[PDB]
Amino acid sequence: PEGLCYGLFGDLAFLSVFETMRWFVDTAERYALAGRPLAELCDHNAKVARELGRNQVAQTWTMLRIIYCSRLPPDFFGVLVRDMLHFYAEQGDVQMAVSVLIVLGERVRKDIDEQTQEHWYTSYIDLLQRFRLWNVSNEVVKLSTSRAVSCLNQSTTLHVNCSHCKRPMSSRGWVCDRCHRCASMCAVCHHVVKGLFVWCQGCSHGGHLQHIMKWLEGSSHCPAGCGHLCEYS
């Protein structure tokens, strides 16, 4: 006669609407995982952690910067870093472990078995997708040290056919071979859409993503002029 269920945003239900995890979202939002040297990455991550209030996380980032981005034996700290990663993982804090794996790179990947690494990666990806954070999830997938996770970002290839000929186009060109005409004509500014080309399933029309976004903000008809109620107003 009783039903209990906990929620994703910390909400508790039993109908009870008990509100009763913004730190995880913020850390995912402003960690830096690539494109910068190890020292800069660790310093930025520690600054973010200290600003949020996780003192131990910032201390861990700075300690990693001391340990790696510098005599003691080269492999004297490998067991320590592996133990720190396992301690973060076992307590349910997966974002820190995955971020350390991304930032350190191959310097620590060999110290952890592929099964546990993939488990951590999948858990963090599931958590990120749960909070509707696609950007950080895709960044983790792309930077993943495990090939299995990196391959999870690839039936993501769309096939395009020119309408004037009903034939396939080359996977690297914007010019139709048969019709000899640009089938990627922009539907607003009338140029060549070499990059992002937003499409409509109904009227099969589209153009520059920014142009279409700006056009739909002031009207509801397809800019190509077909009458298809694309946004239905």
Partner: protein, 282 residues
Amino acid sequence: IHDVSFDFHGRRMATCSSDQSVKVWDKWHCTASWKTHSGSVWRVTWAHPEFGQVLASCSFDRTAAVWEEIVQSHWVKRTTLVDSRTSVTDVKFAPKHMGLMLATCSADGIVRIYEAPDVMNLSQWSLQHEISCKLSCSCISWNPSSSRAHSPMIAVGSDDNAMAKVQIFEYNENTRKYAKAETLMTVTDPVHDIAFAPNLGRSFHILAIATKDVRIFTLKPVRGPTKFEIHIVAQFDNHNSQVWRVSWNITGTVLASSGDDGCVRLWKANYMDNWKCTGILK
């Protein structure tokens, strides 16, 4: 209201009651209230969004139904699972890492597990395995571990003779069939609900059991089903009554427990692995 379940994203709920209605609330105006079953609906659960807005409902009419939202926003009845000769107690989708797999437990002691070969066609399901628990099943809980080191594992809790009321079954790669893996002889009180804690990087599986008290086990996988070092770590008797439902944190750290007293309380463990109550709600 017999059960409430949040969706994957935590923005929608599915509430089923004895009024022959299953309601879906969106962040909370009920966008759809439709009659589902010929009997009272016990549990309704959500599925991973990669398969779409999919609901599973088990009822007293010996049938388990799978619902899907289609575009206003109307819910359709994708499939009926009439394999059960008696009432179906609990139904739970498997974790997304195993694909679209459904498991139902019947009051006759048979746990039936289904799977749709094509995730794009929910109208078809196949009874991949059937497990006999030799006792009246009450609730089941899948193991949400996404690690490749843990085989797909399902635990069945019976509310049935002072025998073990909790059976844990594990997938065997060679035999390609579930089999008994762990039997909790220490749990002889009737079991009303079980809920595995989300793994989320942990090296061991944490099991929460609903009984006359609240019990938490850490089924550590020791190095044929894999043996476990089963050891209860939290015997909470703050309820002073029977336990109905148990729900875990979204990170598998805080266990929400609800008893017959009408009070919902949360349990978390410090760094000594000493579980303690972190709040009382009512």
